[PDB]
Amino acid sequence: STAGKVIKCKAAVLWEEKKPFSIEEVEVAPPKAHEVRIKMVATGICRTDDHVVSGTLVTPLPVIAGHEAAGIVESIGEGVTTVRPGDKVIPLFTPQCGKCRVCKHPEGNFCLKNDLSMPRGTMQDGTSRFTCRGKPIHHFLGTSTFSQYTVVDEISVAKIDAASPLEKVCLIGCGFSTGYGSAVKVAKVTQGSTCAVFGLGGVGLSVIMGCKAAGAARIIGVDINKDKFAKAKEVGATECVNPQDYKKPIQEVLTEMSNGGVDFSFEVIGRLDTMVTALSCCQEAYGVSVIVGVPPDSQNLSMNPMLLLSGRTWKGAIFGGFKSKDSVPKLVADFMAKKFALDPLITHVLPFEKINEGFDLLRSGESIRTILTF
Amino acid sequence: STAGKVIKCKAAVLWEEKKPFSIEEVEVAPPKAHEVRIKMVATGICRTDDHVVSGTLVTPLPVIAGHEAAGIVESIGEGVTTVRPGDKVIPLFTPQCGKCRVCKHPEGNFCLKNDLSMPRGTMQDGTSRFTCRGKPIHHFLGTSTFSQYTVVDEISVAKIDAASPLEKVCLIGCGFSTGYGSAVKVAKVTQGSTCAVFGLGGVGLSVIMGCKAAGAARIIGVDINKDKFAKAKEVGATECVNPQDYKKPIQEVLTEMSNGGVDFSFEVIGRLDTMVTALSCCQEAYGVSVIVGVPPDSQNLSMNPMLLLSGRTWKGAIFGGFKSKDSVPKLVADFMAKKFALDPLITHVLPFEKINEGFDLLRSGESIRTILTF
Ligand SMILES: NC(=O)C1=CN([C@@H]2O[C@H](COP(=O)(O)OP(=O)(O)OC[C@H]3O[C@@H](n4cnc5c(N)ncnc54)[C@H](O)[C@@H]3O)[C@@H](O)[C@H]2O)C=CC1
Ligand SMILES: NC(=O)C1=CN([C@@H]2O[C@H](COP(=O)(O)OP(=O)(O)OC[C@H]3O[C@@H](n4cnc5c(N)ncnc54)[C@H](O)[C@@H]3O)[C@@H](O)[C@H]2O)C=CC1
Ligand SMILES: O=CNC1CCCCC1
Ligand SMILES: [Co+2]
Ligand SMILES: [Co+2]
Ligand SMILES: [Zn+2]
Ligand SMILES: [Zn+2]
Numbered sequence A, B: 001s002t003a004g005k006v007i008k009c010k011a012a013v014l015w016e017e018k019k020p021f022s023i024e025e026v027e028v029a030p031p032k033a034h035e036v037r038i039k040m041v042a043t044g045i046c047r048t049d050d051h052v053v054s055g056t057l058v059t060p061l062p063v064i065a066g067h068e069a070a071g072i073v074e075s076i077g078e079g080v081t082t083v084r085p086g087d088k089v090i091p092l093f094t095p096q097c098g099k100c101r102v103c104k105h106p107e108g109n110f111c112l113k114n115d116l117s118m119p120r121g122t123m124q125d126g127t128s129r130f131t132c133r134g135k136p137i138h139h140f141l142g143t144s145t146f147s148q149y150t151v152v153d154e155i156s157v158a159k160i161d162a163a164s165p166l167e168k169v170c171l172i173g174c175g176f177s178t179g180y181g182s183a184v185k186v187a188k189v190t191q192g193s194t195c196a197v198f199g200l201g202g203v204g205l206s207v208i209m210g211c212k213a214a215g216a217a218r219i220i221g222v223d224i225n226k227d228k229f230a231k232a233k234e235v236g237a238t239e240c241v242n243p244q245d246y247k248k249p250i251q252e253v254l255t256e257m258s259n260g261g262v263d264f265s266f267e268v269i270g271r272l273d274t275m276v277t278a279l280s281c282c283q284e285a286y287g288v289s290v291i292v293g294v295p296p297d298s299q300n301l302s303m304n305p306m307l308l309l310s311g312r313t314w315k316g317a318i319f320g321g322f323k324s325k326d327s328v329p330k331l332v333a334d335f336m337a338k339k340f341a342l343d344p345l346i347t348h349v350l351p352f353e354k355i356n357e358g359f360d361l362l363r364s365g366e367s368i369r370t371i372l373t374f
Helices: A047-054 A169-173 A175-187 A202-213 A226-235 A250-257 A272-280 A324-336 A352-364 B047-054 B166-173 B175-186 B202-213 B226-234 B250-257 B272-280 B324-336 B352-364
Strands: A007-014 A022-028 A035-044 A069-076 A088-091 A130-132 A135-137 A149-153 A157-159 A194-198 A218-222 A239-241 A264-267 A288-291 A301-303 A313-316 A346-351 A369-373 B007-014 B022-028 B035-044 B069-076 B088-091 B130-132 B135-137 B149-153 B157-159 B194-198 B218-222 B239-241 B264-267 B288-291 B301-303 B313-316 B346-351 B369-373
Touching: A007 A130, A007 A352, A022 A149, A035 A088, A035 A169, A047 A352, A069 A169, A088 A169, A157 A324, A169 A175, A169 A324, A175 A202, A175 A264, A175 A288, A175 A324, A194 A202, A194 A272, A202 A218, A202 A226, A202 A264, A218 A226, A218 A250, A226 A239, A239 A250, A250 A272, A264 A272, A272 A288, A272 A301, A346 A352, A352 A369, B007 B130, B007 B352, B022 B149, B022 B352, B035 B088, B035 B166, B047 B352, B069 B166, B088 B166, B157 B324, B166 B175, B166 B324, B166 B346, B166 B369, B175 B202, B175 B264, B175 B288, B175 B324, B194 B202, B194 B272, B202 B218, B202 B226, B202 B264, B218 B226, B218 B250, B226 B239, B239 B250, B250 B272, B264 B272, B272 B288, B272 B301, B346 B352, B352 B369
Parallel strands: A194 A218, A194 A264, A218 A239, A264 A288, A288 A313, A346 A369, B194 B218, B194 B264, B218 B239, B264 B288, B288 B313, B346 B369
Antiparallel strands: A007 A022, A022 A130, A035 A069, A035 A149, A035 A369, A069 A088, A088 A157, A130 A135, A301 B301, A313 B313, B007 B022, B022 B130, B035 B069, B035 B149, B035 B369, B069 B088, B088 B157, B130 B135
């Protein structure tokens, strides 16, 4: 009754930066070859989406944002083989073509078909399946799940379990997987180590879960909002410190607390200063610091290279280093096997119509993850 | 005959920066508790010693420099248990106390008892064994090998094989073992990967030897001195580029050549610009870049954190990551077993009196290592 036809539905359009989302009707074109149309079930409010509003992350406007979601396939285009109509799926904001130099690498994950390095804000064929008021609406990261119906390329969606709580497992599309994978797959947190986590939101808490799951003896969470310490200690943080509660540079404090530096530090905020700070506080000869936060656009940090020369390892990662299409189904299947918990990340659950409310909440500090259930 | 006595010998004292070494007689005190007085046989001229002269590496002046050496123990002091009088040893500019948390970690090697981070230019007890002209003379990295006799702390020296050619294995004391281990231990280069090496001096060529021994498929040598290309090809470099031999950024050129970026890149120069360039030229999703060169002192680089978020791993290392007191006897035993060659590194041989002429060979570019004989 809808396959092969234009679907008229509501979406959250962003016409310009630093303005709230306009909840209006959009025209969703039917899926083309190797494309998939998804009926959204639940979507998360990631800071990454807020970065598009604030101008921190630059992508073509106007746009339908969102990338943390899980829906059910409405219709598939010609040549789609990995998902069928009626399958539960998760949009992958990092694709997995399987044919490129990174996808074939056994330990690489930033597939080259991504729309992040140089945002084109379209499908793979370079066109927009979205229309609002007759104007075409750009895509976001190949997902654009801030809509009741979206279209993704087959490389940007994975099939998850048919018996999946779609209102929880949507966090596996981004927030949880990024933080958990950064700790387990990127940093490679060892048993008994000391970990520092800068930022205690959805991704930062997920990092903490990964470190505790990896057996970290100490997990020091850092945030300038102490209202976040409670949740952090719930999921594994052994101590929480507030840089504003220190007279000297936070890194010096953590060097003391760790008796010479932490084994693994994580920047999970998106500031240049914290990125260098988080690298500074890990052990100068065998420490590892992982950047997870998104920096401001086109904008450099200044850092003493002699901080690496002593033996430090500094690395970043997209989506926790997880190969998206291989891993997102494995994580959904692990979550239901009670391998880890997603519920500690969900603080608010709202109607999609109240999407500017869940965003106002993230900018005031009151939320970790606001799920939007369609 | 001289045990427990003050010894007069020639030494190259550096009085002020950017000045020639002054061959003067100096009073070498006898060894103290856990100290070893060593007679020098051969010492190499490292670019690090020139950093002291130029001011690139700030260390207390006046100083007796030198850290590449091999010699024979004059005498030991009370409580020394690892080296007897007259054993062939190598001073370790990176000590291995074996009791801090670095020495003791499975991969760390920048022992906290080092004199690099906060150089005081003394022994472990804070005093100088060098008297020249009624003045205490600073040490250098607890080695000060630019002297017919020196006194090193027991944790800064390693007994090596008694049949060792000391005019060759002094390079295991720094130049070779640094570049070699940076490739096989630090970067941990893979079978059949593509390697880029910025800098084709003594340390840069050793990286090539490590890269080749690790099974590299392509080893791209980068140097602005085309006269360095012959020796680089001779030790395993498949190609050689002059950055001044391209119109694009050198990192664009290497990215084309590598079809998307190299697997492993090495900065073996000591320039801020080439550190970032060497990091840019490896694969954004799984490239590894190792800094080996010494940057200008307290001088700061500017790089884009988006280079790391995509996946890139950025690290540095001292002495190729080798635990010094452990590795120097093994590495001298592998040279005995013909498992690598030091002869391609030795381009010049001069007497100790010709130290100033040996430095000008390096400053002129005409040399790899000049080996001073005592
Ligand atoms: N590389 C990747 O794959 C992904 C990157 N990210 C980025 O990670 C970062 C964190 O994501 P979220 O948890 O969703 O954002 P968030 O706003 O929920 O959490 C950030 C936390 O850091 C705190 N903070 C802000 N400024 C601080 C400062 N100067 N010092 C200490 N703490 C400070 C905030 O109070 C907040 O609690 C974002 O920048 C996001 O764009 C998010 C998803 C995946
Ligand atoms: N991290 C560690 O453990 C150690 C660090 N080092 C440092 O490694 C660096 C190299 O050591 P050496 O081989 O002995 O010095 P070197 O002078 O023999 O080699 C440096 C090479 O870099 C080349 N070069 C200079 N500018 C260049 C540019 N813009 N682009 C491309 N190539 C350029 C030079 O032509 C030269 O051939 C030094 O800075 C040294 O202090 C030395 C030993 C141990
Ligand atoms: O060359 C020998 N040692 C070097 C190691 C890198 C920092 C400066 C000193
Ligand atoms: Co996100
Ligand atoms: Co050296
Ligand atoms: Zn791919
Ligand atoms: Zn030690």
